[PDB]
Design a binder for this molecule. Structure first.
Ligand code: NA
Ligand code: NA
Length: 433
């Protein structure tokens, strides 16, 4: 597998949350999430990544007019993450196109929503709004399948350029996720993914690269079908940056059965199919890094822990980053509304390598042990950086295979140094006696 890298050339293993669904309908575009909430997250789970929801409607409230005060608010939040050593992926988020479809949808500004008078009647599940005539038309207009709105993708690309212009020099931002769960309307499958979807990604990448040459551009397949383990027809996106391509692949995982009986078997084979397809499309895109941009479930469902642990194990084997859906309060999230921890906290709170001085070829961890094998890179001078939870590591560390450079018992960051001229190096970290 391939990895995103920090400025020191270290390979990044990304672990965090989507923050947050509450942003979707917030008048000011911000999630109901405070700096104290982030402090709690970090203290409880030692996460190092966030998929932070932004919105086109907040970026471009009128055609060609960008809201710099909104971008100030996003920058403020990114600062909270920066102060705690997080890396940030900005997600241009939508579901069901726009709030203006009837609230139910979110994403596009009202001026960019053309339903052409076609109906959007109430449905028993939110996902079924996607196939209502007015919503299908709004998407068909956006992709210019109707031929009536070529301007919409151009506006979208330039809205992304405005965001990239603000964040190009932001050391905490590592990725731009160009579109949440792309939906093709009357176009579905390769006709959509290799057609207007890929075309929008190319135009948007090109626009972004006018102002930001180094942030990873992350592209998703269409969500319907592919979320459930079907193949993607997405095609390769060109990166005009000088030097190596910085495109990454950011699919989601939402097995149909969602964890017991035949449902468990179906979910397990879905993971297998999803893995094979994800690996294939990551190759098509140029042997690119993978970020599992969303997965999640009601943690109060029997079998939830086993599912979660299998997904993280799979991500680890694939060298994938993970942003769990989501940090929002409730049974899916790490905390219930009153602040009580769910199953997720103890499940996610395990040792992991955050930034590796070389390619991690394999690793494992339990509550009181981490082992990591590194393919060396002599060019990297920064140490390997590892998270160790206090539960299992209440005092000092015992490290075999590396020299301890620092052990910060407050931030929970262990830094170690390994030789680069002795082949692959295995580092094992356990609690001091
Ligand atoms: Na409109
Ligand atoms: Na950056």
């Amino acid at each position: 597998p391939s990895y995103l890298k920090d400025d020191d050339g270290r390979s990044l293993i990304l672990r965090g949350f989507n923050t947050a669904s509450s942003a979707k309908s917030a008048p000011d575009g911000m999630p109901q999430f405070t700096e104290a909430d982030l402090a709690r997250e970090y203290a409880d789970m030692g996460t190092n990544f966030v998929r932070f929801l932004i919105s086109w409607r907040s970026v471009e409230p009128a055609p060609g007019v960008y809201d710099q005060q909104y971008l100030d608010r996003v920058e403020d939040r990114v600062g909270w993450y920066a102060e705690r050593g997080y890396k940030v992926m900005l997600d241009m988020h939508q579901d069901v196109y726009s709030g203006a479809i009837t609230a139910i949808g979110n994403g596009a500004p009202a001026w960019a929503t053309y339903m052409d008078g076609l109906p959007v009647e109430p449905q028993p599940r939110w996902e079924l709004y996607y196939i209502q005539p007015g919503v299908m038309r709004a998407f068909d207009n956006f992709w210019n399948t109707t031929g009536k709105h070529p301007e919409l993708v151009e506006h979208y690309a330039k809205a992304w350029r405005a965001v990239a212009d603000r964040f190009a020099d932001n050391d905490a931002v590592v990725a731009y996720d160009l579109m949440n769960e792309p939906f093709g309307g009357s176009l579905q499958g390769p006709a959509f993914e290799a057609g207007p979807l890929a075309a929008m990604y190319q135009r948007t990448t090109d626009a972004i690269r006018q102002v930001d040459q180094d942030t990873w551009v992350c592209v998703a397949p269409q969500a319907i079908g592919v979320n459930q383990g079907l193949p993607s027809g997405l095609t390769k996106i060109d990166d005009p940056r000088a030097g190596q391509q910085r495109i990454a692949y950011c699919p989601h995982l939402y097995p149909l059965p969602l964890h017991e009986g035949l449902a468990r078997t179906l979910t397990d084979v879905t993971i297998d199919a999803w893995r094979a397809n994800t690996a294939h499309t990551a190759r098509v895109l140029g042997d690119v890094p993978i970020i599992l941009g969303e997965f999640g479930l009601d943690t109060t469902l029997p079998g939830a822990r086993d599912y979660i642990e299998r997904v993280y194990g799979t991500a680890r084997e694939m060298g994938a980053g993970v942003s769990y859906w989501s940090s929002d309060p409730g049974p899916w999230g790490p905390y219930l509304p009153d602040g009580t921890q769910t199953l997720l906290v103890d499940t996610l709170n395990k040792p992991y390598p955050r930034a590796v001085a070389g390619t991690p070829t394999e690793w494992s961890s339990t509550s009181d042990r981490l082992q990591l094998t590194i393919e060396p890179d002599a060019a990297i001078t920064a140490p390997t950086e590892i998270y160790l939870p206090e539960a299992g590591f209440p005092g000092d560390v015992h490290v075999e295979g590396a020299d301890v450079v620092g052990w910060d018992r407050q931030s929970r960051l262990l830094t170690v140094r390994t030789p680069a001229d002795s082949g692959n190096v295995t580092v094992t970290v356990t609690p001091a006696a």
